[PDB]
Ligand binder design. Structure first.
Ligand SMILES: C[C@H](CC(=O)O)NC(=O)C(=O)O
Ligand SMILES: [Fe+2]
Length: 294
């Protein structure tokens, strides 16, 4: 039935053939999750699923959690995060072109989930994909001066930079929305590096989209150049996307991307044209927290 073909050596990614979430065994799920923690990306091939079946597939990997802002939610399945620029019956479903920035999912939240699932529905014919950076691999290749400078430091993550304007936000003062974002989703504090509870790797838990500051042990803020140097060194400032840390993951019809939300930061690659693009997303919590300090 299920057959996992991992990429050779330390290459990122792994293809999964003949996977049926309804008939997959417990050993198939454990082996798949083990591939996600080690190969970071698991591409399920030939997935023809309804929105209800996509949620049932995500339930096999963990406990799904719906996005906190309801305008992203699928009308039928509230646990499905919808990124869509294609109206259905003239109504806007989801939010158009999400995640066009380096980030980890729910990084700005106090308890991020460990597994992210992406099921593209409408795929533009050419320049479409998703960039990826292994922050565990990025920390290992950091310069020694940066490793010891961030030792014992903390980082603050906030969605204040890419919080999308909601339909009911029209005609409201922009400072009224800013204070609402800082009230409902205040900046969370995480250690700059944590230990992956599944693999034991040291993960540099930062992202240009969500990480807004860096502090030492006492919470005393450090110069924001330290964060900018970390973004530059890991490849999050390369607008050409030719950095060695950057991996471009494309997909065909029927692919279902399941990747490690602890180690990986990602960025949506969209066309420079108004070409239709629809993607469904399910995000689940596994048997452990983001790290053993949460
Ligand atoms: C703000 C952003 C959605 C968007 O780009 O509109 N949130 C996430 O990506 C997530 O953490 O799930
Ligand atoms: Fe995302």
């Amino acid at each position: 039935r299920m057959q996992i073909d991992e990429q050779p050596g330390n290459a990122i990614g792994a293809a999964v053939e003949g996977f049926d979430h309804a008939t997959a065994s417990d050993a198939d799920i454990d082996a798949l999750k083990s591939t996600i923690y080690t190969k970071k990306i698991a591409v399920l091939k030939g997935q023809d699923l309804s929105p209800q079946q996509f949620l049932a597939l995500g339930k096999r990997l963990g406990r799904p959690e719906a996005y906190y802002e309801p305008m992203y939610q699928h009308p039928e399945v509230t646990e499905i995060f919808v990124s869509s620029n294609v109206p259905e019956n003239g109504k806007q479903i989801g939010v158009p072109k999400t995640g066009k920035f380096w980030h980890a999912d729910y990084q700005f939240m106090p308890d991020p989930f460990g597994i992210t699932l992406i099921y593209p529905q409408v795929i533009p014919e050419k320049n479409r994909g998703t960039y990826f950076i292994d922050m565990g691999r990025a920390y290992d290749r950091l310069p020694e001066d940066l490793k010891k400078e961030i030792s014992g430091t903390y980082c603050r993550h906030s969605v204040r930079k890419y919080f999308k304007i909601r339909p009911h936000d029209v005609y409201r003062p922009i400072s009224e929305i800013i204070e609402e974002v800082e009230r409902k989703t205040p900046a969370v504090v995480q250690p700059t590096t944590f230990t992956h509870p599944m693999t034991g790797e040291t993960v540099l838990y930062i992202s240009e989209g969500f990480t807004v500051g860096i502090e030492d042990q006492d919470g005393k803020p450090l110069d924001e150049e330290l964060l900018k140097r970390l973004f530059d060194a890991t490849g999050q400032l390369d607008e050409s996307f030719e950095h060695d840390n950057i991996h471009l993951q494309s997909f065909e019809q029927g692919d279902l991307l399941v990747w490690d939300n602890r180690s990986l930061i990602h960025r949506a690659r969209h066309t420079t044209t108004p070409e239709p693009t629809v993607s469904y997303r399910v995000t689940v919590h596994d048997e452990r927290k983001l790290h053993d300090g949460i």
